[PDB]
Design a protein around this nucleic acid. Sequence first.
RNA 1: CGAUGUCGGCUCGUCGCAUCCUGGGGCUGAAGAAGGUCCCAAGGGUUGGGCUGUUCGCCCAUUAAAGCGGCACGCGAGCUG
RNA 2: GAAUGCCGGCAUGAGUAACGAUAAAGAGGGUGAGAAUCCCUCUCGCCGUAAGCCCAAGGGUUCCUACGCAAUGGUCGUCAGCGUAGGGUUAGGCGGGACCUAAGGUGAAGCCGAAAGGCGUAGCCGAAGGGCAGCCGGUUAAUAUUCCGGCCCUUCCCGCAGGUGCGAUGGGGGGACGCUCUAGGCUAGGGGGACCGGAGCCAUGGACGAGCCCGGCCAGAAGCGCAGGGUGGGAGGUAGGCAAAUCCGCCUCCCAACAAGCUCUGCGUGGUGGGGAAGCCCGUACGGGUGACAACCCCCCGAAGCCAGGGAGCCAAGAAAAGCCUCUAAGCACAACCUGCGGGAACCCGUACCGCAAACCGACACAGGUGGGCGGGUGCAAGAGCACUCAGGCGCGCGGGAGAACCCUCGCCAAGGAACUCUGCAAGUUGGCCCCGUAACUUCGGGAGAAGGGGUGCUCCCUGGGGUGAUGAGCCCCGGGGAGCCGCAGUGAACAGGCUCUGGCGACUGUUUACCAAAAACACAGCUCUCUGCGAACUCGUAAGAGGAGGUAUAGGGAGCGACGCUUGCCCGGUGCCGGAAGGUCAAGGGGAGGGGUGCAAGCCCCGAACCGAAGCCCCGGUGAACGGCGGCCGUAACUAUAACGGUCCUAAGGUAGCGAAAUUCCUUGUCGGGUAAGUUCCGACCUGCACGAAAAGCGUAACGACCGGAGCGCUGUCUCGGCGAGGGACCCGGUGAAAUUGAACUGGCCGUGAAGAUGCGGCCUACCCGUGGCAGGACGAAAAGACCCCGUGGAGCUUUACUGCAGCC
RNA 3: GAGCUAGCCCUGGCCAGGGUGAAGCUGGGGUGAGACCCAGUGGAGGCCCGAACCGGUGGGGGAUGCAAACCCCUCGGAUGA
RNA 4: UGGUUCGUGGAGCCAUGGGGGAAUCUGGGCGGACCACCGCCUAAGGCUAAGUACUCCGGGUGACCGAUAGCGCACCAGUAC
RNA 5: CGGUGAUUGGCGCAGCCUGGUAGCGCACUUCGUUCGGGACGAAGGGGUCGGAGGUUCGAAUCCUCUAUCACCGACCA
RNA 6: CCGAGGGUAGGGCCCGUGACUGGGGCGAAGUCGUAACAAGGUAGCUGUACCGGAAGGUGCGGCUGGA
RNA 7: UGGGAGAGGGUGGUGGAAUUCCCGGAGUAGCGGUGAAAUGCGCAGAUACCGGGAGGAACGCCGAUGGCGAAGGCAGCCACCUGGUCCACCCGUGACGCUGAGGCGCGAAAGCGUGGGGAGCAAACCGGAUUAGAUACCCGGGUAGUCCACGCCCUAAACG
Lengths: 47, 274
Amino acid sequence: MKRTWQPNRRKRAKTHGFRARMRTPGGRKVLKRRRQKGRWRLTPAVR
Amino acid sequence: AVKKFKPYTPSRRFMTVADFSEITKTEPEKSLVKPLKKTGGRNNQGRITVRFRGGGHKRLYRIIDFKRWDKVGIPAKVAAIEYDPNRSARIALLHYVDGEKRYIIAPDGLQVGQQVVAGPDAPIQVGNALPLRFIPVGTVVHAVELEPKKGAKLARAAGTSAQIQGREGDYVILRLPSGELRKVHGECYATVGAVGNADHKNIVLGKAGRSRWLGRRPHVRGAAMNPVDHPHGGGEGRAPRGRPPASPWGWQTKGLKTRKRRKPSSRFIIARRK
RNA sequence: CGAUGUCGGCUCGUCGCAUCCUGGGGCUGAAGAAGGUCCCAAGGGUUGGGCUGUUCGCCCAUUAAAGCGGCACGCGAGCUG
RNA sequence: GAAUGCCGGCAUGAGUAACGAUAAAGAGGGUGAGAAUCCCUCUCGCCGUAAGCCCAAGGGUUCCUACGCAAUGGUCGUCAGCGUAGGGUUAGGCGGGACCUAAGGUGAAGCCGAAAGGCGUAGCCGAAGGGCAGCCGGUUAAUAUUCCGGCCCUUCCCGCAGGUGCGAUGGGGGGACGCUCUAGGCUAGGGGGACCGGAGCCAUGGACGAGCCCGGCCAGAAGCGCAGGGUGGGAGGUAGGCAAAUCCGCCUCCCAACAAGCUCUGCGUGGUGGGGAAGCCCGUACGGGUGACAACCCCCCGAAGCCAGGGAGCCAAGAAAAGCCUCUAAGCACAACCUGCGGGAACCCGUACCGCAAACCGACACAGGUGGGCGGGUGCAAGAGCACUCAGGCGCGCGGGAGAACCCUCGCCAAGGAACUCUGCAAGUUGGCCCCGUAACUUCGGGAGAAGGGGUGCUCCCUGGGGUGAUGAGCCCCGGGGAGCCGCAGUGAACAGGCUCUGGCGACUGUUUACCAAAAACACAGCUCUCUGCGAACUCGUAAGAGGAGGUAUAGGGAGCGACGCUUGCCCGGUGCCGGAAGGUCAAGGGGAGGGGUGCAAGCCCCGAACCGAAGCCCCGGUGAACGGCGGCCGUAACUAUAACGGUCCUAAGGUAGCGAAAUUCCUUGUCGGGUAAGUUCCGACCUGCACGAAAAGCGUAACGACCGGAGCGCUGUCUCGGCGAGGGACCCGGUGAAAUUGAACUGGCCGUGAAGAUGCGGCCUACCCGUGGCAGGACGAAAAGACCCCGUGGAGCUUUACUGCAGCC
RNA sequence: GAGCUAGCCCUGGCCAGGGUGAAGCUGGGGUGAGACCCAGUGGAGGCCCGAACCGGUGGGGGAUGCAAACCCCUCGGAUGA
RNA sequence: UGGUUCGUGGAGCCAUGGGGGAAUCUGGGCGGACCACCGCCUAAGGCUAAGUACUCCGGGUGACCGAUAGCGCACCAGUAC
RNA sequence: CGGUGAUUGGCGCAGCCUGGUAGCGCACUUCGUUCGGGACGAAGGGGUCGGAGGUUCGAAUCCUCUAUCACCGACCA
RNA sequence: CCGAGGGUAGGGCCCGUGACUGGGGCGAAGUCGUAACAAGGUAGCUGUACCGGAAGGUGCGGCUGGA
RNA sequence: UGGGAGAGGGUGGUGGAAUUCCCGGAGUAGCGGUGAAAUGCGCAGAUACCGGGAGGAACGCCGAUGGCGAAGGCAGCCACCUGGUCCACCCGUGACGCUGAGGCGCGAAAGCGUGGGGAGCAAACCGGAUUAGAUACCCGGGUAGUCCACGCCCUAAACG
Ligand SMILES: [Mg+2]
Ligand SMILES: [Mg+2]
Ligand SMILES: [Mg+2]
Ligand SMILES: [Mg+2]
Ligand SMILES: [Mg+2]
Ligand SMILES: [Mg+2]
Ligand SMILES: [Mg+2]
Ligand SMILES: [Mg+2]
Ligand SMILES: [Mg+2]
Ligand SMILES: [Mg+2]
Ligand SMILES: [Mg+2]
Ligand SMILES: [Mg+2]
Ligand SMILES: [Mg+2]
Ligand SMILES: [Mg+2]
Ligand SMILES: [Mg+2]
Ligand SMILES: [Mg+2]
Ligand SMILES: [Mg+2]
Ligand SMILES: [Mg+2]
Ligand SMILES: [Mg+2]
Ligand SMILES: [Mg+2]
Ligand SMILES: [Mg+2]
Ligand SMILES: [Mg+2]
Ligand SMILES: [Mg+2]
Ligand SMILES: [Mg+2]
Ligand SMILES: [Mg+2]
Ligand SMILES: [Mg+2]
Ligand SMILES: [Mg+2]
Ligand SMILES: [Mg+2]
Ligand SMILES: [Mg+2]
Ligand SMILES: [Mg+2]
Ligand SMILES: [Mg+2]
Ligand SMILES: [Mg+2]
Ligand SMILES: [Mg+2]
Ligand SMILES: [Mg+2]
Ligand SMILES: [Mg+2]
Ligand SMILES: [Mg+2]
Ligand SMILES: [Mg+2]
Ligand SMILES: [Mg+2]
Ligand SMILES: [Mg+2]
Ligand SMILES: [Mg+2]
Ligand SMILES: [Mg+2]
Ligand SMILES: [Mg+2]
Ligand SMILES: [Mg+2]
Ligand SMILES: [Mg+2]
Ligand SMILES: [Mg+2]
Ligand SMILES: [Mg+2]
Ligand SMILES: [Mg+2]
Ligand SMILES: [Mg+2]
Ligand SMILES: [Mg+2]
Ligand SMILES: [Mg+2]
Ligand SMILES: [Mg+2]
Ligand SMILES: [Mg+2]
Ligand SMILES: [Mg+2]
Ligand SMILES: [Mg+2]
Ligand SMILES: [Mg+2]
Ligand SMILES: [Mg+2]
Ligand SMILES: [Mg+2]
Ligand SMILES: [Mg+2]
Ligand SMILES: [Mg+2]
Ligand SMILES: [Mg+2]
Ligand SMILES: [Mg+2]
Ligand SMILES: [Mg+2]
Ligand SMILES: [Mg+2]
Ligand SMILES: [Mg+2]
Ligand SMILES: [Mg+2]
Ligand SMILES: [Mg+2]
Ligand SMILES: [Mg+2]
Ligand SMILES: [Mg+2]
Ligand SMILES: [Mg+2]
Ligand SMILES: [Mg+2]
Ligand SMILES: [Mg+2]
Ligand SMILES: [Mg+2]
Ligand SMILES: [Mg+2]
Ligand SMILES: [Mg+2]
Ligand SMILES: [Mg+2]
Ligand SMILES: [Mg+2]
Ligand SMILES: [Mg+2]
Ligand SMILES: [Mg+2]
Ligand SMILES: [Mg+2]
Ligand SMILES: [Mg+2]
Ligand SMILES: [Mg+2]
Ligand SMILES: [Mg+2]
Ligand SMILES: [Mg+2]
Ligand SMILES: [Mg+2]
Ligand SMILES: [Mg+2]
Ligand SMILES: [Mg+2]
Ligand SMILES: [Mg+2]
Ligand SMILES: [Mg+2]
Ligand SMILES: [Mg+2]
Ligand SMILES: [Mg+2]
Ligand SMILES: [Mg+2]
Ligand SMILES: [Mg+2]
Ligand SMILES: [Mg+2]
Ligand SMILES: [Mg+2]
Ligand SMILES: [Mg+2]
Ligand SMILES: [Mg+2]
Ligand SMILES: [Mg+2]
Ligand SMILES: [Mg+2]
Ligand SMILES: [Mg+2]
Ligand SMILES: [Mg+2]
Ligand SMILES: [Mg+2]
Ligand SMILES: [Mg+2]
Ligand SMILES: [Mg+2]
Ligand SMILES: [Mg+2]
Ligand SMILES: [Mg+2]
Ligand SMILES: [Mg+2]
Ligand SMILES: [Mg+2]
Ligand SMILES: [Mg+2]
Ligand SMILES: [Mg+2]
Ligand SMILES: [Mg+2]
Ligand SMILES: [Mg+2]
Ligand SMILES: [Mg+2]
Ligand SMILES: [Mg+2]
Ligand SMILES: [Mg+2]
Ligand SMILES: [Mg+2]
Ligand SMILES: [Mg+2]
Ligand SMILES: [Mg+2]
Ligand SMILES: [Mg+2]
Ligand SMILES: [Mg+2]
Ligand SMILES: [Mg+2]
Ligand SMILES: [Mg+2]
Ligand SMILES: [Mg+2]
Ligand SMILES: [Mg+2]
Ligand SMILES: [Mg+2]
Ligand SMILES: [Mg+2]
Ligand SMILES: [Mg+2]
Ligand SMILES: [Mg+2]
Ligand SMILES: [Mg+2]
Ligand SMILES: [Mg+2]
Ligand SMILES: [Mg+2]
Ligand SMILES: [Mg+2]
Ligand SMILES: [Mg+2]
Ligand SMILES: [Mg+2]
Ligand SMILES: [Mg+2]
Ligand SMILES: [Mg+2]
Ligand SMILES: [Mg+2]
Ligand SMILES: [Mg+2]
Ligand SMILES: [Mg+2]
Ligand SMILES: [Mg+2]
Ligand SMILES: [Mg+2]
Ligand SMILES: [Mg+2]
Ligand SMILES: [Mg+2]
Ligand SMILES: [Mg+2]
Ligand SMILES: [Mg+2]
Ligand SMILES: [Mg+2]
Ligand SMILES: [Mg+2]
Ligand SMILES: [Mg+2]
Ligand SMILES: [Mg+2]
Ligand SMILES: [Mg+2]
Ligand SMILES: [Mg+2]
Ligand SMILES: [Mg+2]
Ligand SMILES: [Mg+2]
Ligand SMILES: [Mg+2]
Ligand SMILES: [Mg+2]
Ligand SMILES: [Mg+2]
Ligand SMILES: [Mg+2]
Ligand SMILES: [Mg+2]
Ligand SMILES: [Mg+2]
Ligand SMILES: [Mg+2]
Ligand SMILES: [Mg+2]
Ligand SMILES: [Mg+2]
Ligand SMILES: [Mg+2]
Ligand SMILES: [Mg+2]
Ligand SMILES: [Mg+2]
Ligand SMILES: [Mg+2]
Ligand SMILES: [Mg+2]
Ligand SMILES: [Mg+2]
Ligand SMILES: [Mg+2]
Ligand SMILES: [Mg+2]
Ligand SMILES: [Mg+2]
Ligand SMILES: [Mg+2]
Ligand SMILES: [Mg+2]
Ligand SMILES: [Mg+2]
Ligand SMILES: [Mg+2]
Ligand SMILES: [Mg+2]
Ligand SMILES: [Mg+2]
Ligand SMILES: [Mg+2]
Ligand SMILES: [Mg+2]
Ligand SMILES: [Mg+2]
Ligand SMILES: [Mg+2]
Ligand SMILES: [Mg+2]
Ligand SMILES: [Mg+2]
Ligand SMILES: [Mg+2]
Ligand SMILES: [Mg+2]
Ligand SMILES: [Mg+2]
Ligand SMILES: [Mg+2]
Ligand SMILES: [Mg+2]
Ligand SMILES: [Mg+2]
Ligand SMILES: [Mg+2]
Ligand SMILES: [Mg+2]
Ligand SMILES: [Mg+2]
Ligand SMILES: [Mg+2]
Ligand SMILES: [Mg+2]
Ligand SMILES: [Mg+2]
Ligand SMILES: [Mg+2]
Ligand SMILES: [Mg+2]
Ligand SMILES: [Mg+2]
Ligand SMILES: [Mg+2]
């Protein structure tokens, strides 16, 4: 039956992408937490 | 004149569809439509503000002259009488001698090929616009402004009429279709005649889905709810309501007036509705 | 109570006897046939249905008889539900 | 040494269950160190509205090739979607962007907010929608509407040549639209052929035959031809399309009224370009040659696709902007635009491979899920159904034997037909089409497929209609009559209702607890009450703002009841709500009588009574489709019995109609009547209604129901009452090989005992050691720190005339 | 966090084949005119049978499963809420 | 109303949201209600190092650890998953 | 089996907590009216206050305990 | 082939019967009330609708079989 | 052909008196009601009076033993549409007539469905008096209904 992950690159980038963090003051702090941890990928990797 | 059905299925034994005999023109004027952005109940927050709205058929907004002093002195010929889906009422297409085309909302017994004119000059027969200070007392009337120069805001559903009952000062006294008596300023325009399609009352929708075609979703009784959701809900059985009956938000719904008391319009209202 | 799955039915039995029948007997207000009561006796047997979830019980048609209880009111790592 | 402790390691179950759809395999020959598993050939089986092709999403090297098998593959492996390496994705015309707008997002102007931020017109972004110029073949091991070949188009830019006032992001037209049913003509596609082109073949009794078998196409400018879509043409006047217009719109006489004419498609033909089986010979796995100088002809069926913006009907009344045409504005009129010709310029990204699946989402090469297109043939009335089968793809990545119990999935059965059981649960009977015929009841539609029947195949003879054809043959679709044939049986296989009587509930289609409840619950049309005069009420929000609504009392919100039929009685004392400029009460504020603290005093500073002080409460009325409520005890009538009647207490009034052992009845299996041989259920009544009752509706109601109850007919393995048979497991052999569990174990019975249910204590009895296939009585077996109960001054969810606050409103 | 799920908004697509045969028309009958009655045509419906598609009724299997909701038979809707 | 030790308390002082609303040395604030006396400051504009807090970074030291320890990582770790 | 209420003229009821009194309505009964009876009108009677015990000077009335009487509850398995 | 007749299935009519139920009639001299006949003490009757233990009352219109 | 009357029928329109309600002025301690009372209304300013406004129904005098219609029935006034009828002239047709089972249409009031309207009155209902009792008569309130449009219902002491 139909499971939860049904993938889409349009959905993934427009929701989780870099420019969609930097609208909101919350998601600007997400990248701040992820610079500071040392993340190799700040945003989820989409083609 | 309303049209009834044989019971060849269930829910055509009581189904009832209006008479479209006054309708001459079966596609609207292309320069006088614009698309109606459906809301679904939802406001600019995306939240439902009116429950149980949504669904149902698509609609192009027939843009209607309600403010009828643009064209004083300028008569007009009734081309056509049309369906509006946005309305109870039928609509009249007016070809003007000035060359413009407009929709007025069609009064009862207007027919097609009629010279019809706004103004103060403006003879008292059906379809014509005047200020209220020039219309004779006792005459029924519709499409009434409330304050002048502001747009026709009164007495424009189907079959409705207001009726002039007096003059007093710069204000005239109107009998509103609620039964309210009401001081309306004399320079408010108003369009003489009852509105009609007055058989709109007697349409019986027959089945559930005909409410869905108008965009009327199902309506849930709060007795069928849970007490998180409603004051009436709950109770291990059927319940007689607990309490004085009540909205989802708490306020009572048998009898409770909620007109704002200090509203300055109440100085203009003589007699509340019936 | 860091779990002993509960009523009834099905299947499978097994035991006790304070015995329903068959067997042996004493008394009888036991003429005979059929009964009543008590004693000895468990070796074996103790039907099929209508109603009800029913155990129980009330009926139907039979029977030699249509016995009472224990086994976690036997039996759900056997079934049903 | 213990914490169902943490981490790591290794054991037990155990060579145990399992090895992932019961679509199916066998042989021969190669390769190889090693073959059931790799390649080739033959035979067999499976899919074939797919398990076959093409897209899209998603995945991201999996594609091709050479060399390999440690690990991945539920076995093996020489193989691979795996390891190493090399190669492979070519566009002006396909898709997307230098085009457009939709929901929505952003957003100068502007509004709002303690900050962060929230709105928001224009504009911009935003696409499986609109717009736009490429069809068919051939090559690669791997790409092609991309490379090559042929034929054909689109933008720009520059030149000549010929026409016109050119000219905007501005005005107008168009783009531009629903659902259902459809006409004419085409096409895709398919069937037949005595005609044509073909390597070949007469087998086993017969046949050299109009025999069998294979194939008889594709694209293609202009110009024709055939269907079809769009549109009227001149003259004036003009105040509207936010400037101006010759345009558009509105009038007024004139010409057709038509597709006549203009364009624009589609389809045939078209210069010419290409393709071209079956069989045989082969060298590879994949392909090549010949067959061929191939033929490339004629009928018939014919679409849901095309002409397309076709037509008719209906209500629920069915996107926007750009491209395109036209009109003018400044500006420009040595420009600029239009047509034809010629030359030149045409950028960025994707393209491979999987794609109903071993490459996507499910930790797996997982029986699950995944949007669009093509989906051939025959027969069954039709069909995308069913059975078989072209093309094409497969035999599902463990096998070999055996022929136990037991399980699963099937097949059949004497006599009985529900005796089984909670219940005919399950399985069986019936089953499609044609034709007779069809009840109570009813809202006149239905009930209806009621029920119950008869026919169904094949051959021959006569005969009536259509469509294409020229009114005719042929080809296709429908019929009728007569005679006969065979079998147990003719929808001969597969797909394809069991029926009837009655009651409860809900009117009906529908919705729901994804993942134990699909129902009598929700919803529903419909009825009523109530609020709301528009900057409406209500809702979200601090606000701005927005929904309501670009709606206006025939409209919008809240509540209840839930089609329809006949109806909805009494109580307003308490609660709620509605209406009352009286009065009682009531805070800040006003007011200051009077008194106090200091000062030598002017002064400075405090309390403070009358009195004026809103809403609300008290009070006064109304209000039941508002919250709600709707009695008790005595006596009395020509037998008893009962009470039409009366007396009395109380209430705010004391349940009316209609139902009633009911989804409501404790006593209760109430008591009668029907069904039955027998009926705690069912049906019909009586009323003694613990504890029905009128919109939390009352009583009925045709039809409807995967709802619940009762009965009967048909039919049966449900049963008496079992028996046999089939296949997938179980059993044996070879390969791979878990799990929960586990204090350690050298783990018998009875009677006792022991924290009261003992393999382990006592007495006695029994008992050589170790396994295998089975059954479940015990190990208070396993699993989950009981989910029922109680405790904790534990926690949440809900309610109110509990307390205390807040929003909100006055 | 609405790539599952619930609702709504914008833009697209899908629903083989059969039945039943409403309104409305045409002709005839009828009447003063009607209402109305016959045929024929017509093709309506939260209509019927039933594949795709959407569901999940009853039973059997499955229960360290093919699967953390499955499989087989059976069944509901299938032009519409 | 907030701050202060100050929870309305005898509640001053310091900031304030709302209403009223002065003066310029004979002016004004304060010394814990208030008054008198006696004293102390000069609000409604602003700037001002040092002494103080911390350790992404470099260095030194340790009755700190020694691969289940020590930072989550001694090892290409905020990685694989 | 628990709880809290009632028993009073023939009948259905008030009377109490504020300890002394026992009353209303119907009924019964004598009279009056009408031809007779009923309604009316005038006059009258009517009590173990279920019974046992004490608290005091005194109980229907206050407190115990019996016997009937309706009435509520009997819950979680 | 037809065919007396038998069988299956479903309808139409009639008769007997049926727990219980409704009204009707006749009964002994029962209970409750006074509706109507006199202006029957509210003139009566009537079609209809509503209500009441009951005759009956009331609303609407009508009638003279009363003034 | 020419005259005449009439509440004959349908549609549209309009006028006045009066009842109720609202508003304003003024005004007091009672008004209604009965057989008598009471319920009830009323110092929260009623009855009574004046002025203004809204709405519904019926149209006084004319008017009666009148007229019209087939019956039910029909009443302010105006117009339109329309039926029946009476007289005269003796012109035309020329026996065309009478009745009429069915059928068809009309058919007071009450009642029903849908929508509207609702001043007065008033079944049901609620009070207050009468009475032994009152589900009635009397009094005070009061819902359907009475009114309109459409469609039903088809009755009567529809009687002369
Ligand atoms: Mg999406
Ligand atoms: Mg437009
Ligand atoms: Mg927005
Ligand atoms: Mg948002
Ligand atoms: Mg609802
Ligand atoms: Mg609920
Ligand atoms: Mg919630
Ligand atoms: Mg909520
Ligand atoms: Mg609540
Ligand atoms: Mg209940
Ligand atoms: Mg209650
Ligand atoms: Mg409740
Ligand atoms: Mg326990
Ligand atoms: Mg344990
Ligand atoms: Mg256990
Ligand atoms: Mg013995
Ligand atoms: Mg003996
Ligand atoms: Mg003996
Ligand atoms: Mg003897
Ligand atoms: Mg024995
Ligand atoms: Mg028992
Ligand atoms: Mg036993
Ligand atoms: Mg037991
Ligand atoms: Mg059991
Ligand atoms: Mg057991
Ligand atoms: Mg066990
Ligand atoms: Mg069950
Ligand atoms: Mg340890
Ligand atoms: Mg220890
Ligand atoms: Mg092991
Ligand atoms: Mg084992
Ligand atoms: Mg084994
Ligand atoms: Mg095995
Ligand atoms: Mg496998
Ligand atoms: Mg096959
Ligand atoms: Mg991709
Ligand atoms: Mg992947
Ligand atoms: Mg790779
Ligand atoms: Mg490969
Ligand atoms: Mg290789
Ligand atoms: Mg390997
Ligand atoms: Mg291997
Ligand atoms: Mg090898
Ligand atoms: Mg590779
Ligand atoms: Mg393109
Ligand atoms: Mg762009
Ligand atoms: Mg460029
Ligand atoms: Mg744009
Ligand atoms: Mg924004
Ligand atoms: Mg916007
Ligand atoms: Mg596009
Ligand atoms: Mg597109
Ligand atoms: Mg190609
Ligand atoms: Mg390829
Ligand atoms: Mg490619
Ligand atoms: Mg031009
Ligand atoms: Mg434009
Ligand atoms: Mg063809
Ligand atoms: Mg062909
Ligand atoms: Mg052919
Ligand atoms: Mg040949
Ligand atoms: Mg031969
Ligand atoms: Mg072709
Ligand atoms: Mg061609
Ligand atoms: Mg202009
Ligand atoms: Mg034409
Ligand atoms: Mg051509
Ligand atoms: Mg070839
Ligand atoms: Mg069209
Ligand atoms: Mg644009
Ligand atoms: Mg560029
Ligand atoms: Mg490709
Ligand atoms: Mg597919
Ligand atoms: Mg999984
Ligand atoms: Mg596999
Ligand atoms: Mg994988
Ligand atoms: Mg799969
Ligand atoms: Mg996978
Ligand atoms: Mg699918
Ligand atoms: Mg096909
Ligand atoms: Mg086929
Ligand atoms: Mg066929
Ligand atoms: Mg055949
Ligand atoms: Mg078929
Ligand atoms: Mg097809
Ligand atoms: Mg198939
Ligand atoms: Mg093949
Ligand atoms: Mg056989
Ligand atoms: Mg048998
Ligand atoms: Mg047999
Ligand atoms: Mg039988
Ligand atoms: Mg039995
Ligand atoms: Mg039985
Ligand atoms: Mg039973
Ligand atoms: Mg049953
Ligand atoms: Mg069954
Ligand atoms: Mg069969
Ligand atoms: Mg019948
Ligand atoms: Mg039936
Ligand atoms: Mg029929
Ligand atoms: Mg049949
Ligand atoms: Mg039936
Ligand atoms: Mg044959
Ligand atoms: Mg043809
Ligand atoms: Mg079949
Ligand atoms: Mg039934
Ligand atoms: Mg029942
Ligand atoms: Mg239902
Ligand atoms: Mg349903
Ligand atoms: Mg569920
Ligand atoms: Mg769940
Ligand atoms: Mg269902
Ligand atoms: Mg379910
Ligand atoms: Mg209703
Ligand atoms: Mg708010
Ligand atoms: Mg709007
Ligand atoms: Mg409303
Ligand atoms: Mg509403
Ligand atoms: Mg309900
Ligand atoms: Mg009553
Ligand atoms: Mg009350
Ligand atoms: Mg009240
Ligand atoms: Mg009151
Ligand atoms: Mg009030
Ligand atoms: Mg006050
Ligand atoms: Mg004060
Ligand atoms: Mg003061
Ligand atoms: Mg004061
Ligand atoms: Mg109160
Ligand atoms: Mg019974
Ligand atoms: Mg019986
Ligand atoms: Mg019985
Ligand atoms: Mg019954
Ligand atoms: Mg009963
Ligand atoms: Mg009850
Ligand atoms: Mg009830
Ligand atoms: Mg009620
Ligand atoms: Mg109720
Ligand atoms: Mg109901
Ligand atoms: Mg019922
Ligand atoms: Mg009925
Ligand atoms: Mg029924
Ligand atoms: Mg019902
Ligand atoms: Mg159902
Ligand atoms: Mg069997
Ligand atoms: Mg067997
Ligand atoms: Mg076998
Ligand atoms: Mg093995
Ligand atoms: Mg041992
Ligand atoms: Mg023991
Ligand atoms: Mg030992
Ligand atoms: Mg021992
Ligand atoms: Mg063993
Ligand atoms: Mg065991
Ligand atoms: Mg525990
Ligand atoms: Mg506590
Ligand atoms: Mg607590
Ligand atoms: Mg979603
Ligand atoms: Mg969604
Ligand atoms: Mg169909
Ligand atoms: Mg027809
Ligand atoms: Mg149809
Ligand atoms: Mg349907
Ligand atoms: Mg179906
Ligand atoms: Mg398809
Ligand atoms: Mg799905
Ligand atoms: Mg569902
Ligand atoms: Mg299922
Ligand atoms: Mg069905
Ligand atoms: Mg159905
Ligand atoms: Mg403080
Ligand atoms: Mg303070
Ligand atoms: Mg305190
Ligand atoms: Mg201040
Ligand atoms: Mg101060
Ligand atoms: Mg101070
Ligand atoms: Mg001091
Ligand atoms: Mg100082
Ligand atoms: Mg300073
Ligand atoms: Mg470490
Ligand atoms: Mg180490
Ligand atoms: Mg670590
Ligand atoms: Mg419990
Ligand atoms: Mg409880
Ligand atoms: Mg016969
Ligand atoms: Mg009398
Ligand atoms: Mg009388
Ligand atoms: Mg009465
Ligand atoms: Mg009368
Ligand atoms: Mg003559
Ligand atoms: Mg003659
Ligand atoms: Mg009538
Ligand atoms: Mg009437
Ligand atoms: Mg009516
Ligand atoms: Mg209605
Ligand atoms: Mg009155
Ligand atoms: Mg009265
Ligand atoms: Mg008369």
